């Protein structure tokens, strides 16, 4: 609505975590989650 927000509110990814053998965090940044109208302006391709 107003106060567009578009920021993380709920965390349903996983209920809990007990043992962690690895961790990594990137630098702070800000990504625009605001919706857009029209065609798809971004393309992301990943190989794992």
């Amino acid at each position: 609505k107003n106060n567009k927000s578009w920021m993380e509110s709920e965390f349903r990814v996983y209920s809990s975590a007990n043992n962690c053998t690895f961790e990594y965090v990137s630098q702070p940044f800000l990504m625009d989650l605001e919706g857009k109208q029209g065609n798809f302006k971004n393309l992301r391709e990943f190989v794992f």
Partner: antibody
Amino acid sequence: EVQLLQSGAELVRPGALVKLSCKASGFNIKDYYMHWVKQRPEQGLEWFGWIDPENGNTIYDPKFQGKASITADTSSNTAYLQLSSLTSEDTAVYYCAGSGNYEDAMDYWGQGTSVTVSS
Amino acid sequence: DVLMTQTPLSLPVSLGDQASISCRSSQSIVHSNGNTYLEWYLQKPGQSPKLLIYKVSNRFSGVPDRFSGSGSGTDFTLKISRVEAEDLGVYYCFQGSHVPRTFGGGTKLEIKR
């Protein structure tokens, strides 16, 4: 009518802690947010924080940061607020709110618990 | 850290009259979808606050039809078409949004005589 059940009153000495219960009635707590409030006659209502039973995320007002932690019991659909490191200024009536009917617009409030910090 | 002030502090209204409680907010919470994140409450003497109106323009279920909220921008008011004895209490404004929630000072209602 959805209602939240809380303890009538609590008697706590300075420096000790209390645990305020908030039992769900007529709804499943897991599907709705839970909120807590502090009230004293001189200032009125003061917002404490909110908890998400299904996500576990909690937000606390700076006025109460470091004094309390919010949790809940999924099995009994009961929300708990722990009030520790209490002093005379913490004497207040505490309420819990939740059951927004699958919308972030509504909530239902219990009768409230009168917490007095005295010897 | 939202700041709001409720005017008037108190107001007596005789049975059958209309009550008006206004609140001013330091942040705009008016939305283009027709809803406004400000919940109205009534705290009857000796009872906990009870929700009256949710999102300003939508009446809460189980509340008498006399209760209805309206306003825009940062100024909003609660209108009671006809007031009764059971309406006695303190009316509070409750801003919503995705930021730490805030409470108002409250407005007291009395039955005029």
